[PDB]
Amino acid sequence: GSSGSSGTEEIWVENKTPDGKVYYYNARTRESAWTKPDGV
């Protein structure tokens, strides 16, 4: 807990659907995807 931080994250945003599922929203494409793509 105290230690162990991710650090830098993609340009995506962390959110959670109104059902109870965490997803990621891209500010570049303005899309919604559970996980974030690689090679960005």
Give the chain's largest Cα–Cα span.
34
The Cα 20–Cα 8 span in angstroms is 25
Residue whose tokens read 């919604």:
32
Q: Is residue 3 domain-resident?
A: no
Q: Is residue 1 domain-resident?
A: no
* CATH code, domain with 36: 2.20.70.10
DSSP 1-40: --S-------SEEEEE-TTS-EEEEETTT--EESS--S--
The residue length of the chain stands at 40
Best CA proximity match to 14, nearest among 35, 39, 38: 35
Number of domains, the chain: 1
Q: Which domain holds residue 26?
A: 8-40
What residues does 12 pair with on adjacent strands? 26
Q: Is residue 37 domain-resident?
A: yes
